[PDB]
Amino acid sequence: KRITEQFKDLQSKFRHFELVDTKKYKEVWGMKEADVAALVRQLLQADKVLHEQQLGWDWRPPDDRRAAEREQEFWSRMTHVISDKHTRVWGALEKQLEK
Amino acid sequence: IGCQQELVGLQNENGGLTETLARLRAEHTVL
Amino acid sequence: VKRAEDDLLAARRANTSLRADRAKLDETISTLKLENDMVSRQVKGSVEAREKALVDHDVLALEVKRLRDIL
Amino acid sequence: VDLESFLPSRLLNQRKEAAVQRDLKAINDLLDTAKGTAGR
Amino acid sequence: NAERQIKNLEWENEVLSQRFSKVQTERDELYGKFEASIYDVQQKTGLKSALLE
């Protein structure tokens, strides 16, 4: 009887853990992707201000297993939204403003 | 004059030891 | 003959000196290798701890955001 | 032309090093030995 | 034999990685010097143009 009731409890716990873990992972990914979207919005605003005020002359916004490749693509996109071009521009510009 | 033969053996192992000690110095630096 | 034997004695003392130098260097090298592997183990443990802290961190951030939404 | 005359120079165009050189020499020697052994 | 291979591969990888680190840092500094020089010469050209105007 002990092992039978233990089996039933194990099944119920299995279901509960499945639901809880899936929900938690989904929710945390959603929250943190919203956070990084806010950060990249801030970066875009900074880039626009820098160009239009100092030296842009023109500023243009960008456009916009399986889960693993999806997430890798997402992070790569959101970190490559701003290019080495712009990073070097910012560094040299900072030095020039200093002098 | 087998003294000279044993001396020559000492000289050869001396050269080998020099090379090995150079190796160990580089080893220590990188470690 | 005496010249050759003096050369032999000089070779013997030089060999002993070089052997002592080699022994000291290799013993120190062994100690360095032991130190390096143990500190690498420590660094790996630190990496694991940092990852666990990050997971706890975003858990706490999730809780904060949920309570903020309720407010 | 007077302002043009003024300032033409701007108009026109260790131990740490020794230690780093020592370390690079040692590591280069080790690489020499390493590829020597790898080749033979 | 496999353990011996582990030791050898680990050591040679470490030394190669150290060489990579050194070359990367000083290639970075050389690139920075090149960038500074090109910006400086363009500044000089612009100043010459302003004087000409």
Add this chain to the structure above:
Amino acid sequence: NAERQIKNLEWENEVLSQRFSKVQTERDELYGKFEASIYDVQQKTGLKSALLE
């Protein structure tokens, strides 16, 4: 476990080997390109500078 370690370490060894070779080639080309490239931007502004002159 030994064979997986061999395979992973060999792959890392080779990949870092090509990366080291390519960064060394970048060094070699940059050293030559340094002097030549500086004059190029001067000729880029050279046309307008000569027109003003």
Add this chain to the structure above:
Amino acid sequence: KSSMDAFRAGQAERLKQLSLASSGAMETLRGKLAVAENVLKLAELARKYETEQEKVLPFWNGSEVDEWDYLNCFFRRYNKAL
């Protein structure tokens, strides 16, 4: 119980990898933003000594832009100050 442990371990590992990669990306982005805000602060402080002349005309009296000729108006302003 084996199924239990395997599933829970898989979830833990995926959470680990997500958190680590995301943290690295955020650190890089925050570094970029800090550089940008330092640049803006330097610009703000520098424009205090500018006269109203260059406060209202800092540039002079349509394809993409290359990095070499990327700062020409700023160099114009620099030359005016010189």
Add this chain to the structure above:
Amino acid sequence: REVISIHIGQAGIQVGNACWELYCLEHGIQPDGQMPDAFNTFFSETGAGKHVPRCIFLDLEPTVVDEVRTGTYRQLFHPEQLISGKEDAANNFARGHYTIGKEIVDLALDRIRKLADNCTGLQGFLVFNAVGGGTGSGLGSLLLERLSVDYGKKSKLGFTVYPSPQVSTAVVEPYNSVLSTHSLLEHTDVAVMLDNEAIYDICRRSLDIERPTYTNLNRLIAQVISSLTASLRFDGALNVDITEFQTNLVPYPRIHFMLSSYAPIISAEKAYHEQLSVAEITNAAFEPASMMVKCDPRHGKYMACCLMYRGDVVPKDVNASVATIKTKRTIQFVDWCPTGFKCGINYQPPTVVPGGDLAKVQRAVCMISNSTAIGEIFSRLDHKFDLMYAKRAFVHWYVGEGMEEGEFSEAREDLAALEKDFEEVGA
């Protein structure tokens, strides 16, 4: 708050022989180590009222170490810290750094580390040496490099003796000093500079003695060390510690070579007659004849000065005296810093050594100043080294003992660079 004390070579351990007598007299510890909080910096307590110093004395020649092993202070020290080599470095940088230097440094360091472990809170190292010889210069350079590699962030104070401009004992001390600056500049963090001839003249002028032995020099340098460390132990109105020294007296990373002065360095018969109030001891601490180094501050400018007042001092007369010093004309501060002073006061009056030369004075002042008046010393040493290096003289000894040429090339160019750095930071 504790600080470790290491003494390398004849001069360093001889100075320490008076430093520890002065310390025991200050803290009331009997020579055997008994007293019938304030000492924790210099001593560690144990037993039934027993205290032992936080010092090591290491030297190659055991002839002098036996003197401290037998002379009335045997019970004071731990009978392991008294390191003894086998034979002197013979004024040879290579013999003290490469030949014999590699054999005693292990036993020295494995003892320094355990003393540091015993120490509750580490706050600094202080190293006594003279660059006038091999045993001091080479071995101290090696050990200082080893400590910089091991600990690194902890402060180091080298109380270093240069050779006098003309009153010189050794013949190879130009070589040795030029080869020891390569560490004394790059590895230590604060250099407190001495010179024998300056103390000779100081005690000839004020202490009215014409034939001063080394005892007088050691005593009036131990007094400076005690006045330096008094702020760590005793209570004061404006206590100033080692990190204060570092942050206030080192404007640039490679400019740390500071002079020193003490006043009143007075006899026992002038003490009653001549008055030693603050407003005049401060002035008496600024004349070029009261500098413990044979240098002329009028030939340069003062970067930053620091004053320590032991004894009965009220913090307003110091302000008045500093105002007078600034309004004076014979001295001229570097135009960089308006606030060029680092005041500090204590409460324990100067501690007389019975049978000594100084007197029971109510108060005293120790001044340490960083100024451009030392490029002259560096230049004179460089010149008197280059001239002997011209004919390739005395160099075969170093060549056979381990040096080849690069040591001399890099030391020469390094000293040139240091002199140029002082020149360019001057104006």
